[model samples]
Every structure is written in C-alpha cells, then in structure tokens.
Target: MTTAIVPRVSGGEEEHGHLEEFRTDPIGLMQRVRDECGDVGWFQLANKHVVLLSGAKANEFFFRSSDEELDQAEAYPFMTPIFGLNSALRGEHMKGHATTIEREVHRMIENWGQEGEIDLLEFFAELTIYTSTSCLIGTKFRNQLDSRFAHFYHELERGTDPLCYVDPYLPIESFRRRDEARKGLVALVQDIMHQRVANPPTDKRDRDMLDVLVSITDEQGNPRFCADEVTGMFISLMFAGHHTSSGTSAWTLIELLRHPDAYAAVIDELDELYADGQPVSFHALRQIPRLENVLKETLRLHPPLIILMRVAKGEFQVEGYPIHEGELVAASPAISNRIAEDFPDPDEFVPERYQEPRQEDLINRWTWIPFGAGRHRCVGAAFATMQIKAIFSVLLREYEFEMAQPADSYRNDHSKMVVQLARPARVRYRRRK
Candidate 1:
C-alpha cells in the first residue's frame, strides 16, 4: 500500500475553527467532506487530527476493524468518568422486557392529564427513562428512585458537552456536576443492590437487570463485577438506551404527523391488527410491519447519534491514506444512511422502501446502521426498538396527537451529541373514545 496521507478538507474560517464548525453541524461537515474529498479524508478538530470515512464500504471497514486497529474506547475517554463501563439477554428475557415496557407505557400516560398541550420530546425522554429503568434495572427504579436520580442523570448528560470531549476532568462547573452525579448514581445503585442481596428474587420472572449484574460470575463462578463496576454497567445501559430511544420515539411520531398519508397507513395498520379487540402485546407489536417500517425510516432520517468515532491504536490506511496511531477516526450515520446509491429518493420519508421487492437496506449490510454496526454496535438496539414500538402502540390506541406547530417548522437540533428536535417541538393529545 502507498504511504500517502489522506487529503485534508479545508475549514474556511481561520479563527472560527474547524472543531466549532464541525460541532455546529457534524452531519453537514461530513457530507461536505464526502462530496469534496471522496470516501476518506482528514480534517482538523481543534488541536486533534480526525480522519473521516464515508459510504457503506468505509462503514463496514471502520466498524468491522478490531479495537487493536481502531480503539473505540480510546477516542471517547471522556465518557469513562461520566459513564464508567459497559449485556447479552436471551430472546425470552427480551420478551419479558417488552411486557415491562408496555406496562410502564400505560402507567406513564395515565398521569398526562388526558388532553392538553405537551412536549412529546420531553414526554418520550421521561417515558423511556421509566421504561428503561423498569425493564433493565427493575420496577424499584420506577417505584422508589426519586427526582434526585433524574437530577443526577441530567447533570451527567450536561457534563458530556463539547468541552468535556477535549478534557472531561477539566475543572469546569459542568465537569464537577458530572462527577457529583456519578456519585449520586453509584449510591443509588449500591442501595438497590443492597436491597436485592438482602432479599434475592425467588421467581425468575421477578429478576431484572440489577439482579443479573449483581449475580454475574466469572469462569470460577466468583462475582464478576464489584459495586463500582456494576454502577458503571447500569449507567452505560441507561445512557445508551435512554436519550437515543426517546429521540427516535419522538421522531417516529413526528414523521407520522409530517406525512399524513404515511400516518393514515400506520393508523390503518394498527386498527386492522386489533380490529378483533386484541390487546396490544409484544407478540402483536411484532406483527405490525408497517409501524416497524416507520421507526426504521425515522432512524435513517434522524439518527440521534450522528457520528461514531474511534481512535487509531495502530497505523492503518484507507484508500492508501495513512491513519496514524492516536489520530481520530469517524463515520457519520447521518451521512451514510442518506447516500443516494443506498437509498433512492434519499430525502423522502418512505417507509415502504424497507418492504418486499425493493428492500433498500438489504442493498448493503452497513447501509442502515443508525444504532451503528459490528462489534461495538449498540447493545440495547433491540430493546430500544421494542420500547419505541410498544410506546407508540398504546399511545396511538389511546390518544390522538396534533403538532403544536406546523411539521416543517421543526428541525433536528444537531448542537448536541444526541441529536433532538429543535425547540417548539410540542404536540396536543386528546384521549380517543
């Protein structure tokens, strides 16, 4: 292979800074780089050197590469203090989670005051936390954890801003708050573990994520994780699933509202599925292919995690351009999912593209990776999907939602790492007869 360096994309403003430009709209920057420099290129990010990769082939290569070649954890070390560490659940256990999610969904909406204006974005954010905790940590988090837990989680999230990426332990207010939040979360987790150990679950069905973590054993059947590690594991699970799941949930509904014909098709499919008055369950939710399509399409259009990044631990080359150790490597899901070759009419919200004859995502294995791909792919992908579908299933059955502002008025807020709909993203809901 040639020892040539990848071509660099010029960041126009000298003082405005490429890192600031990239942070303002990472997806846009990636798109510009792809169009200008082809599949592989380099760009400046403050003091750091970042090699950006695009297209399905690049995605496969980037994702499939081992941590030895491209160290995923090394790139975002800021997350270690904030998050801590990182489940394989069997199919039946997931079904149990599905039941837990649907039950939580009903409980969540019961408090929504029956018919008024509300921010669906906020609603989903709160709702998913409950569903995630109930299913993953256990119902105790839903029943016992106080507003303090949410307060700490918010602090933890705030600490993950642009500054933290540079140096997470910076002596900044946000960083301090993040450290405090982690302490609060760890105490809460230890408290729960204490209770679980004092009286372990007698029934297999009663056991939840916390139970599994505390009980995990090594090859010799000794305890696998200590208290701090278990806490980290809890944070990692919640962090991965919570924000992204909520954003996807809101986007899926917003997309349905934006496209009335698609909305009608989804509602019609839901009605037909339950025309016999069957209660919505995990099994029944699985049967709603059209609804699943809507969620898939939403993920393609508005993936919450816009960019996946890793650090080069060893030297490598892409298209003969050298990627040196310690250099940052990234792939943009927002860009890859929209490439014209992989998705015909890429801008349109056409769920049917995932259907029968023209299964577009199948055109390339890495084409539709909103939750990412390969080894470090999101562990909660299945849980997130099931949770979103379960949430909408019951909500659609019980309530009718109308956008507070015209659909076009809303746009994806790319300022944060977890992309959300821009503000003024509210909706009105009324209970259906």
Candidate 2:
C-alpha cells in the first residue's frame, strides 16, 4: 500500500541518462522502469520529480487524491498556453460546464448521424471539433469553415511533440512554423466569432454551445468572456476534443479488427439493439454491453494520454518518500491497466473482462482510467464515449473491414504526447449486405 523510498542523489548521472532515453522511447523507458523500479518508483524528468505507478492500488491513490495535493497546472505548464483560461478548471464549474457541453455534444451526434456512409474518423473529428467550438464559444460556424476546421485538427496531432514543450517560446526557425500554425488557427476562430456576433442566428431552439457561452454572465451582469477569450476557449476544446477521440476511435477499430470473436459479439449486439433500422441513440449506445466492454479493453491497452502529470503543491509523503512542495508526480494508465495482477492475461485483448460479474470486479476505483481522473480529468469523457459508440455502431452494421497489410506492419510513433501509428492504416471496407 506504500511506496518504498530508496535514498539517492537528486538528478544524478543515471537519472539524467534515463531521462534522455525516455525522450526517444517512452514506452520502452517505462517498461525498463517497471522492470527495475518495481510497480512504483520516483524519477526526475528535466530535474522535475515524478512518480510512475504501474498497479491498481497505486493508481487508485493517484485518482482519489485532492487537486491541492497534486496540481496539474504546476506539473504541465505547457497546457496553459494551449487551454487559455485557468477558470476552465477552477471551482465547481467543472461538473456544471461539462454537463452543459455533454448535452450539446449529444445533439450534434444526432445531427451528424443523419448523414450515411461517411469515413468514421473524419466524420467524428469534424463533429467533435464543431461541437467543441459550439460549446466553448457558443458559435455554430462548422459549415462555413470546414477546411480551416480540418487544418486545426491536423495541427493538434502534429503540434503535440515533446520538443515543443522543451522551448515553445524560442525564436528558432522551427518555432516560426509552429507560430504560423497557431496564428492561422486563431484567425479562423476569430473570423467565425465575428460573423456570429454581426448577425446572430434566429434559431434559438437549436442554439449551440456558442449561444450558451455568449450568454454566460458574471454576477455583475458582465459577459463571462470577451471575443479573443472566446476564441481561445474554442481552440482549447477543439484541440482536446478532436485528437483524443479520433486517436482512441482509430485504436478501437484496430482492436476490433484484430479480434474476430469480439467483433462478432459486438455485431450481434448491434443487430439486436438496432433491429428496427433506428439510428443508435445515446441511451441505446450505452446499453450495448459487448461494445462497451470492447471499447474499455481498447482504452485499457492504449490510453490516449499515456502519462498523467501533477505537481506537489505542498509537502507530501508517497511510498515513504518525502515529496517536497513543487515536486512533480506522474502515473501512466497504460502501465497500470496492464498489470498482470489487475488483469489476468493482461496482454490479451479480451472484452469479456468488462462483462457481467467480471465487469463489477474490474471497476476497482482506478483499475481503468483511459480518460484520466481527479479535477483535471477530461471534461468530455461522456461526450467522447457517445460519439465513439455511435460511429462504431454505424460502421459495424454497414461495412466489413479487411486489413490491406499485416497486423504487425504498422509502427508506433511516440514523438507526440499520444502514441500515433507510423503510417496511415490501409484498410478496405466493403459494403455489407
């Protein structure tokens, strides 16, 4: 239940070398850590302290801990430049705002599903980004700026390099390109806001997240956010919403294709649930036990945010080590979810672990945290699940996918925060009779 602290030199030669190795291959680095440091250990990254937890008990403690005990803002300073306002995480607004956004997200799913035979990845990314924009700024400009929206989503995937965090403000030649991309995104969002304010839409009934944001007023009756601030919020939501859902969805599909038996089970569930030719509603999507379990297994194996970081706001004790104020702590759900003790046959892609009596057994606090935990946990968790399920249901019922290449052909590219496939997966989808 407690971590055993071995006293050692702070940022010594060995630690520095390990840090450099981690930059190149994070998964390999973590594997080495698990091999050498046991399930939990303290290490330093760029002189910042961190804890890597690889078991159920350790992960449980990390999630249930207070925000003041382990603050994300201090641990990930790079996020501030991206998320804009700190208020996004402050107070009880987290749950309230998240709920409001979830409703609009579900509404967008209803609208998007009306169209048929779309590329699920591209379709989901567009809808996710558009919904985020609508909710964050209360604007509905998705139709007018499709190209710009696509570019923004692409940039999020590209811009998440760890190198970007090393010196994001540096004026090197490479930084110029990144800056240009940021400006282009800012301009696109600004243009949309301008149009929305100039001539507001008369359809109040279908007013999206943008309308809610526009109407959010302080106690003194002042607008919650100005034009530029509104644009920044839109940027944050779009980047967070689009990339994670798209990445997770892609991985989930890949897992389904890899497991024929699991795929058949999900297909059977789809037939039973949607037999009346009705589009999969939010409630229906949640009811698909097999599909839900498969998605959970996929997330457990390949969490989008493999590493969750936090800073020690005050002196604390973890595993017998005195974690001084301002020290950093991090845990990898990717590591924790795969522990052999927590999941029997941990490496296997078995959805049954989340079914029936087994499902109840696996719900141990932090045994599965693909969306993260605590106050800084992803606000769009429910929204992402709904979108993923809807897209999967449509894909399962309509098309049959065949891998164009061998399963092991694709390489894992860990250059970004999320592990990305080295190349575009070449898969052929034939219409199902």
Candidate 3:
C-alpha cells in the first residue's frame, strides 16, 4: 500500500502557494500544473486551498457530482450581489426563441454604418446586452432601459475578481460601485414587476421573464421568487450570458479573420444557406457545420471562463487523492482542451478537426466544455450558441471583417471572470450587401 501525495504549487517559505502566478496568468499556470504535476494538483490562495483538476476524468467528476457533495453556489458568494444564480435546455422554448435572436442581431447590424472600424469586445458586449435583455428579461428592458442600466451591469461585472472571492464586501471602489449597481438593478426590476402586476400585458407573447417570475408560485402557493429574487435571477442570467456570449462572439470573429481559409469556408456556408436571400432560420443554422465548427474551435482555443470552481461540501477521493470538505475543487477548459492527447496540434485553429473522419472533441465527452458540463452546466449554453451563430451568420453574410490591429499584438484579458480579447481589438468591417 503506497501513500500518494498530490503534487502542489511550491510555496517556498510559508507554503502560501503561487497566488501571484495564478492571478497573473491563470491559464498558463494551469497548463504548467498539468504538465508538471499531472491532472490533479494543490494550490493555496493565502489560507484557502484549491485542488485544480484538468483532463476529461476530472471534468466528469467535477461537473456530475451531486450538489450536496460539491456546492457550486457556496463557491461563488461574490456573485450574490451581482447575480442570484443552470443545467439543460428546454427544446420547444429555445427552438422558437431563434426569432428573438435573429431580430436582435438584425437590430445591431442595421444600426452599424455600411463600413466602419469598431472595438470588437465593446461591439459584442453591446450586442449581447441587447440580445440577452430582450430574450431573458424581455423587450421592455431592452427598449426602455437607459444607458445607465448597462453601466450598472458593467460595474457589477467588475465587482468579480480573485480578491472578491475571498471577501466580496471588502471596502473597495469596485465593490462599492457593485453594491450601488445592485441597488439600481433591484429598484428598476421591482418597479417593472409592480407595473406588470398592476396592469398585466394584453398579449401572452409579451409576458417576459419578469412576468413569469412574478406569476410563479410554490407548492404552498407563495411566490417562488420575490421581486428582489427575480432581479437577482435576471442579473444571474445576464451575468452568465453577457461575457460568454460577447467574448465568444468577439473571439470567433477574431479567429476567423486570423485564419482566412476558415473564414472563407464560413462565408461559403452562409452564402449557400442564404442562397435564396432569406434570413437564416433556426433549422437553417444547424446546416452550417463549418460556422459551428469554427465557433467550437474558438471556444476550445479561447474559452471565456478560464476556470470553473466548486467548493466541496463533503470529503471525496479524486483518483485516490483525498479531497476534504471546505476545499475548493476546480477545473479549467482552457487547460483541458489543450491536452495534446485529446486535441493534436491543440494550439492551432483547425475548425475542420471537429468534422467527421477526425472528430477530435468526441475523443472525450468532457473535453469540449467551454460552457462547462453535466447537471451544473450553464443554463444558457444552448441559447448562447444559437445567439452567437445567429449574430455571425448575419455579420459574415453582410460584411467583411479584417483585423484593425496587428495579429501578433493581440492578447487575452483574463482580469475578469470572463476572458476578453485585450483592448485595441479593433476590427474594420465593410458591408458586402
């Protein structure tokens, strides 16, 4: 009987672990851990210990475990002020929601001038704000809310950092702003709910997320979610959808521009799909495998969320390694997707690798988890994919995108919960139609 000691990040003096390195370049750090220490490694954030897990086996365990065994909500208390927040898609609802996605995409595209250079990250951020609000919160919030609502959401987003995870209430400028944003968001949502309750919408189709929340009841007939809870839920959806959708949208186009052959293939798919000059329907979107693969590869190469974390509620053994309750359990798609065994030449942008004959992602079920996996998987996973596909389908069909910055100079901004392309990610677009 041999005792196996899990490899850990060297802490030197007090064994505080490489928090600085982890903070500075988490993706790089995760890769180093995987390369040097194998899939399971230990690291400490000051006093808080985290067990970093990579590879498909770890992902399966991390995502599939019961909530009682591994609590997702407890690990993300920093999100309470920003969100309230998952799992699978509802088919009938999502299928019909494609129209909302297309309409939002068209709205943004229609507003853009025939040709112009724009901040890629900012552009998609705005686009997702429109799409998510309309689809999740409803048209009123999308059409009626002022610019400040977006600014508030941005502040809430900024509230999340490595430090906030330790203490969300710390007397910091960002935290204060986040609190203010939360107050504003709650006030606005409450007012809307009151108005809707007083005079409900005439059309059932117009009944949005807020309406549903306001009307829902528990087994006891009490409201399932109060106004504050409803607001928190809305913010939760926005928080989940915003960065992933915007960042992925930005990255997908960036990858396409960087690889012209891939971009050309996407154009060909779009052109053939829209040969009749009709807008792409939800069913039509399924036919564009090239575009889908490009998006998939983009997620693989540059996932918005570098890390997914959960705190253990009970002791468990991870491949014979003891994991105690209260220890943080983590997984990284950024690291897992790059395992050369799972994806050969993983660094390269090869969308075709996802196609038959060589279905790389299919090598392991848990290998391609940009939106994460299992029961605790992102609720908006399907919706986000559909929305991004709709957006790019419209954009590529109507415009030509070229990088406004040097390709070599681009870098990922990993400072926030979501990974975004670092600024000066400007892109010049010329209208094709």
Candidate 4:
C-alpha cells in the first residue's frame, strides 16, 4: 500500500490483479478482497491497474459520471476487427433511443410461432437478433437470421473468447477467421445502408433504427456520421442486444419451470390478463407485476453481465480513495448482491421478496442493479424485460415446459462476456391441450 491510499488486496508489489484467480473463482476472490481490503482497494494485471468498489453508493458515482469525467475501460484488441477504431459504442447516445417495447415483444412472439420443445438458449439468440435488428437496423434485416450473415456474425462472436481478453492480439487461426468474418459482415451492412439511401421510405415503420441513424443531425440538420458509421452502429446494436436477452429468457424459463408454484402463479396472472388468448398490447404487458418480479429475480440471480470494468478519464476519488487517470475499476453484481444487506437470504432464489410492500430492489435502488443505474445505465433494459415477458406470456399460456434435469444439476457455462448454460441444455415442452 505504498500510495498510502487503497489497500492492496492481491499483496503483490508488482502486478496485483491476478486474472487467473479471478477467472478461476470470481465470486470467491471478490468475497476475499472485500473482507481483507474493506470497501476500496485495487489489484494490477498485465500492467493494467484495476480498483474494486464494493459499496452500493459508488454505483451512482461511477455510472452517473460523464464520459468527460470517467470513460469506459479500453476494450479488448480482438474487438478491433469486430468494431473498428472509430466505433460508435464508446460515444454518446450509443444506446439506441427509447422505442416502443410492446411492439418489440409482439415482433418476437409473432416470429416464435406455435412451438414445440426447444432449448431456449439457442432459440432466444435467434429471437433476439431478429427482433433487435428489426428495431435498430429496421425490419429488413430480420430475415437474415437464417442467412450466411448469421454465420459471419458468429465468427466475429467467437473472436471474443476468454483468451482474447487476456491477449487479444494472438496471431491464431481463429483471430484470422474473426477478421475475415468482420469484413464480410461490414460489407453486407454497407450494402444495406446504400440501398436504404438509394430508395427511402415514407411510413413511420420505415423510420426505425436504420432511418434514425441515417437522419442523425447536428444542431443544424447536417449529417453527423456517414454510411459506414451507421453500419458500425447497426452491427454494434446486434451484438449488444442478442446474447443478453437470450440468457435472460433462458434463465427466466429455466427457473419458472423449476419452481411450479411461481410458474402457476404467473400463468394465472397471464391468463387473467389475456383470457381470450388475445395478443398482448404494450399497455397490458407492462402491467403484469408478477412477470416483472419474475424477470427481476432472474436478473438478480443471473445477470448476463456479472461484472463490469470501467476507467477513470482523470484522477477521481470514489469512497474516499483517490484514483489516477487510466486506472481500471471493477464492480460485480455477482459479488455485490450477496452482501446480505439489501437482499436478505441473498443466495436463495426468492421472487416474493420483490413483490408488493416488500420490494427489495427499492430497498436500495443501487443494490439490485441488473441493468445498472445512471446515464451510462443500459438503455436496453426495458426492451430486454418486455421481450422476456412476451415470450413467457404466449408460451406459458399455450404450453407446459419441463427441465430436462434437476435444477441443482445445472451449472453456468461462463464466457468472458456472458455466463450462459452449459451446452445441450434440453427443456421438453408439450401443448396445453
């Protein structure tokens, strides 16, 4: 602790952040750090400085801070191929503007069709990209889910393996393939942008994400970005929207199927709301408090983004610890929620805790952060929540689902990005007839 500042949790005078320890036992390492170093401390890894902020109060300070004050941490190098050096993600209004959640849900379930048994992990990925692009890139891209472009997207996706975050510059065959995939996808998006420009649309639906990006203007109605920039934003939305919804929907169904009482309760609520088997409107879907809590509980237990990495653009003090510019900071929903402070019996899966009068999340708004809080908070939060509800509303009303194995038998198959289920995640279903 030479700085007479934050305590050193890893105890190494050299590089203190043990990426290996964090990768092996993330939850354990966080618990250990908090125990030893109190609320503020840091570790170093790969010559990078990372500070930990376990206090809930720090969530607001960190998230609400402007980019001018504190910016996002440096992205892994492998991402360079996927999103170029001038990527829009690191800029403002990066999250799409608020759109209608009701229709997004409708778009999803309409494509879902009358279903048979299917593992939701795979199903939700396809569902999310189709719906996500429809909202962001416009409906024209929805049909491409079954096309070669999908494979191209996957190639880019695999480049983000855990090893890539450690050393993204690895000159391996996979990295080469990742670069190739990026080229194909970028060209395809460019073509789509040009076509839209060559022939514009007249209706409101035509003015979806594609149109919005095209029409983005300065204080004067001058173009802010060119066709290529719009294409990058288009691709970025697909990446942002896909896996998060997929994992949330998968876990939502898994837990509900595993717990019949909660399942039955939600079904009754959905049945009462859409008794005639009518399509759910944005107005009606948002009112289902039970489903909302169910989704909330799922997020609390298994957020797609378990941990976050941010940077201080300049020197800043959080929880009284002075941090220098370019220092990496870490926060974990996985570790923070287990503190037994706001979420009592924190490890247990209890949806009722989020119910009326006992709204645990409201107990401390910062404590139960799934989508996070503040200006940089996830703009896709509402969209993801509604998608889960819509999928469940139709499926829960029309069919019965069962876990292929015991609930406890399941385990998380983690990635450097999202922690999803292990492969071959089978869930059987039959019609409600």
Candidate 5:
C-alpha cells in the first residue's frame, strides 16, 4: 500500500524542474505532464510548486474558486514588469461593447485582397491589432497603426515568455529588448494620453476607453489617468485584447482549411446567408450558427492561452487533493475542454457537436471555457467572437483557401507563452467567381 508522490518538473532539490523545457515547449510540456501524471498532477520549477488540474470539476474550482484560496494576485507577478507600473492587468476597468470591434473588422476586410497567397498568421496578427486598437484605444489611434506600429507590438509580445513571467529581469538579451520595447510603447501611449488629457474630446461619440479614463474620478473625485496608469492600461489592453483574437482566428482559419467538409459548410453557410459578394453585415453575422460552432470548436482545439494559473493563498483542498499554501494551481482550456468523457472524439474537429443532437454544449458549466470563466473571464470575448465571424465570413465567402501545407504540419509555436501558429504559416486563396 504505497502512495506515489505526484510528478514534479524533472528537478530535484527545488532548483531541478525542466524550466527550459517548460519555457520552450509549454504545450508539449503540459500534454506530457498530463500523460505522465493523472487528472490531478503536481510539479515544481524554480522550487515553486505547481499543480495541473485537468478534470471538469477541476476547472470549476480553478476558475470559480475563491481568490482567498487561490489568489490571482500572487499567481501573476510576472505580468508586472511587462505591463509596467500601475498596470491595468492587475486593476479593474470599464468593459466596452464589441460593436466597435465588429465595425472595425468589416473595415479591415477591405485589405484582405481579392485572391492571393499569404501568411495568414501574419495577416490576422495585423488585423487583430488594428481591430483591437480601434475598439480598445478608439478611433484616434486606429489610423496610427502601420508596420512601425506593428513592430512595437511584436517586441512587446515577444517579451511575454515564461521566463519573463517568472523573472522579468533575467539579464537576458530578450528581456533587455523587452524593457526597451516597453519604454517605446509606453511613450507612445503616454503621448496619446497626454493629448487626451490636454484636449479632452468634446464629442462623446469620439471617446473610447482613454476618454472614459480621462475624467474617471476615484469616488473621491480624484482623476484616474495618471501618466503611468494610462500607459500601463494601454499596454494591458494591447496584450489582453489583441493576441488572443489573432491566435484564435489564425487557428480557426487553419482548422477550417484542414477540414474540407467544414470548409465547404462554411461556404454553404455564407452562400445561404449572403449573396452577390455582399458584405457580411452585423445582422447577417448574427444568423450564422454554423460559424459559431466552428469557432467554438477551433477554440476547443487551439486556445490562445493554454494555461491559467493561480497561487494558493493557504493550505486548501480542491476536491480531495491538497494544495499547500503558496503552491501554483492551474487548469487548461486546451486540455479540460477536450476530455473524451466530456466531448466525444476529443481529437477530431466536429463543429456541430455543440448543436442539437450532440448538444455537447450543454455540459458541465466549466467544460467549455475558451475565453476562460468566472470573475476573470475575458471581457473582450464578444468582441473576439464578432471579429472572427466577420473576418472568416468575409474571407471564406469571397475566396477559397488552399492551405499550402497540411494543417497537421503547422505546429503550435510554444516558445511564446501566448499560443500562436509556428512561422511559415502560408495559405493560398483564389477569388470565388
């Protein structure tokens, strides 16, 4: 009668786990951990304890569990440096409607080109950034985005590796570059904030988050948009809002191309819903149930963020498993949403599983959290969804994609903590006649 200790991160004496492996290939690492460990798994890195919770029940507790037990504040110190002083990531703010996002998506679709070969990940990265900026930063900064604007974002995005998450200052070249990028991005955002402060938009319609933050009084009538706070909020929005949609959209298109039937169904859907190469209107988008399933299934398979973690506040038990105080506990949407028991044929892509007969959608409350769940669920979920539906509808309807490589060949780029398609993500398309 021997009870085996849960697995660890291949380290001994606290300094041992495979930190390099975790940083370089987190997706693989998590999958491997689940394979070697069970539903409830344990590991360590840098002497910090971590647990992997893969069960549906695990998700409910991981997301809904009281912060008093698993404090998110303790779990996310890594974001402090990247987001900057008084960052909005650790603070609460207003949530804007996605109507702006929907409008921006259609506007950006003009650049999609009639038919051509392109790196879709690259294109969607641009699209998501512009769309997110227009909505999050408002119309003022929307037109300011271009290649140089994009470079700043890339630099900022690269800074979000796992190592930086744990230690922002690791005396590394990447981190040094990250700091530089943060400064450049901060100055840019700060200038915008300063302008907004100096010349507050008289037209309420001209306002966005920055405008809201402009005169935001802290109950005491104290202004909220200090230089650092505004800069931090801008970076926080840039990070939280953009990349997730970019990755999800890239994967959605990839998955759609990979499955011919689904791809055909998408065309059939658009054709049935809209004709004469007409633009996909908001009303038209609302009518596409199949698109919703496809997007959900895409998220089920390739969630932008694989791991959501929280640090245990004190010694607490999740179900029967004991999570000691200060240990890190996590639940993964990529893993939890696809369990064979919860979703039949978890590996295969079946969009309609969410539909009538299958009705896989009506499962455990925690089973299908792509944008996460509970208090921390992404505020931009509706916006991201609208962007995807609008973009995919436009692209799939007007052009037929012939993916350059097999979809399976396009591996996940796990180097960045934010999941993305590996480079060389090319796809060919011809205008539908």
Candidate 6:
C-alpha cells in the first residue's frame, strides 16, 4: 500500500482567498508551488486535501504508477455527474475497454479537413462530441441535430463553478441544468439507436459506431455494455474527448496567429507538402514538421486539462515524502510546462522548440505532458493531433489570418473551469485568391 502525505495551508483567509488570485495568474501560483513547496507538496483548500507535484519524475510517476495505488476516480467525483461515466473507473480500463474506444476515435479523424475560414474551436467541439458519441454509443443520429451544438459547451462551462466544490452533496442549480442537458443528449442518442434497431442501414459506410457496439460481445457472449453503461460511456467520451480537443485547437490557432513568422513557416510546409487543394491524408499529415511544433508549443503553453489530480488509494511515498491514504496528488501541466529548465524563456511562444534537433529531446515521453503520460495519458492524443493538423492545413491553405487585437489584450478566464479566452478570440481571415 502506498502512503499519502497531507499538509495544511498555513495562511487562513489568504489561502482560501487565493483562488481568485490563482485564477487571474495561474503561472504565479505554479511558481509558488515550485519555490515554496519544492515542486511536490501537500496543502489544504477549503479543508480539502490537495497535493502539488512538478518536474519530470513527478509527472512520470503519476501517469505510469499502478492504478490501484492512485486513481483518478477518487479525485474527480465531480466529473462523474458531468461526464455520465460508467462505474468502471477510467485509468483502470487503460488497457482494455478504453483502448477499443481509442481505436475507433482514430478512425473518425478521417472525416475532417475542409478549406475555409472556420471557428476551429466550435468545429472541433462539435466534431469531437458527435464523433465520440457515435463511437461510444453509436453515430446514427449525426444529421438530426442542427449545425450549432453549442449547448453542451455552454453547460460544461457553467457547470464548472467552484460552488460545486464548496458543497458536493447537494444538487446545485448548475448540476441540475447540466443534468437536463445530459438527458436531452441521451434522448437524441436513444432516438438514433431505436431507428437503427427498427431498420438498420445496409451500406457499410451508413453503419455508425452503434453497429460496432451492438456487434461487440463479451467472453460470455453477452453485450459488453448494457443500456445504462452505454449511455454513461457515451457521455464520458463526449465531454472528455470534445472540450479538451476544442480547447487545444483554439489555443493552437491563437498561438500560431500570434506568431506570424511561425504561421508563415507552417503554411510554407503545407504548401510544399500538398500542391493541390486535395484533402491531406493521415499519412501526409505526419510530414508537416512546423504544424506538429505549433501543436507541441501550444499544448506546452496551454494544455487542455491544466491540472490532473490523483487520490492516494493507500499509504505511499512520492519523492521521499510520506503520503497518507486518500490525499490528493496533483500536477499541473500548465505549471510544469513553464518550468525554466524544460522551456527556455517559457513565456514566449516558439514553435522552433518542437522542430528538428530541439524536438528530439523535447518529445521525451513524460517531459512534455500536454496530453499527459502513461496509463492515464489521453487516449485520443493521436486523433486530436491529426484533427488539429488537418484542420490547420486546410485553414492556412485558404485563408491569411491576423489577430484583430494585440495578443496581450486577451485575458484568460480560469474562474469558470477550463482556462478559456475571457473574450471571444476574434481574428480576421481574408480569403486567399
């Protein structure tokens, strides 16, 4: 059994009140963690136990450690309602069930890639939610919903209120609203499932992921996922896969646009790689060095899930420090990525850091954890990377983008949940003649 360590935050009012300050300047808080807490330490937030870990070794252990010792399940109970996840915990299924879903995720990436001015965030969110739902539950209902599926995003945004943390027992208004949204989504999925049962599509292409689920049988020859489990799994996949990918894509575009020189280099590579206006294939997508670097740099700067938490299942030691059972151990990629040792002049956006010789060491497994590392590492990493590249390739080929306002003018709103642009990230994309 692994031991856990818990520490009380020394300052009283200042400690609890620090949430707002941390929201405004997350990097500042991370620097405090590295300096005062020694890259890994425990603290109390509103009397709740929390741990902060930094640097390469810390990241590696959390991601690769045995799930029985430390599990995300205990740390992220709030997400259970939001995501509609199944009873089967996430990291525990790292190899089996999760692996199957991830394979299907990659297959869905083949459908994207169109040239024109687009809100990469909106498009990615919709695509990810739709595709993930289709894969986990079934995809027969793609055409039923309108083009704008913004409700899911809005509900997720609103549901992230810290009030939920303040009182986890009651059904807060936000939770109720989120529950309604979940029901609406489930009803839509059910409609599609019923239709497929009534009259299944004969065409192979017409058959969606629901068909895949129906066909899948367990060792006992029974359905692997029952109806409730199906719904829960679908919900899990939708939110888990959707918002994070959209957030990363949005940041990628913002970062590239912020650095026009890097943008130009990426565009040049795309132009050279594909002379015609044809859709870039998955194989071709891998060849664009600059595009990859832009994503790497973007993820390093703004990872989708800024902080990941693991609750000690048993008494354990981390970095020679004693950890008590049930203590929360967390590592913020947003914080660690900015460490001066891993990234030079960490604040500046530099795509070259991910290019050629620089990238060789930079891509080391656990060192740069935009999608995390090891067992709990994002299963959709490959698909998300492909989608971002394909979308960027298409967007850059057709449009010349420029920021409407200064980069520094935009503020990050971390109060709600995910660190999002405080204002709509408005940019002008002139059509390429």
Which scores higher on TM-score, 2 or 4? 4
Error at 317, model 3, angstroms: 1.4
**Stretches of model 3 off by over 4 angstroms after superposition:** 11-17, 84-89, 202-206, 212-227, 282-284
Residue 258 lDDT (model 4) = 74
Provide the lDDT at 183 for model 2.
66
- TM-score (all chains, Cα) for each model: 0.89, 0.80, 0.90, 0.82, 0.86, 0.80
Error of 4 at 295 (Å): 0.7
lDDT of 6: 0.63
lDDT at 108, model 3: 72
lDDT of 3 at 300: 92
Best by TM-score: 3
Q: Is candidate 1 or candidate 4 better by lDDT?
A: 1
Model 4 scores a TM of 0.82
Q: lDDT by residue for model 4 over 175-279, one digit each (tens)?
A: 778778877777786776677667667887655466566666788878777755655666776677777777888888887877788898998888888766555
Which stretches in model 4 have alpha-carbon errors above 4 Å?
Answer: 1-3, 11-17, 73-79, 85-117, 162-167, 190-228, 276-278, 282-284
Better candidate number, 1 or 6, judged by TM-score: 1
- Residue 427's lDDT in candidate 2: 56
lDDT of each model, Cα atoms only? 0.77, 0.63, 0.77, 0.67, 0.72, 0.63
Q: What lDDT score is found at residue 6 in candidate 5?
A: 50
> Per-residue lDDT tens digits of candidate 3, residues 76-111?
757766774222246555645567777777777786
Q: What is the C-alpha lDDT profile of model 5 across 1-433, one tens digit per residue?
A: 2434555534333354655677776766677667877677876656567888877777777877876777765665557767771232221312222344445555655665676788877788877777767666656776655665667777677776666544768777777777787787767767766777788878888766677887788878888567667767676766777789888888888888898898888789778777565545443436578888998898888888788888887776665767777788988887777778888899889898888877775665587777888766876666567667777766676678888987678877777666677878899878778
Lowest-sum lDDT 10-residue window in model 5 = 85-94
The deviation in Å at residue 119 for candidate 2 is 9.7
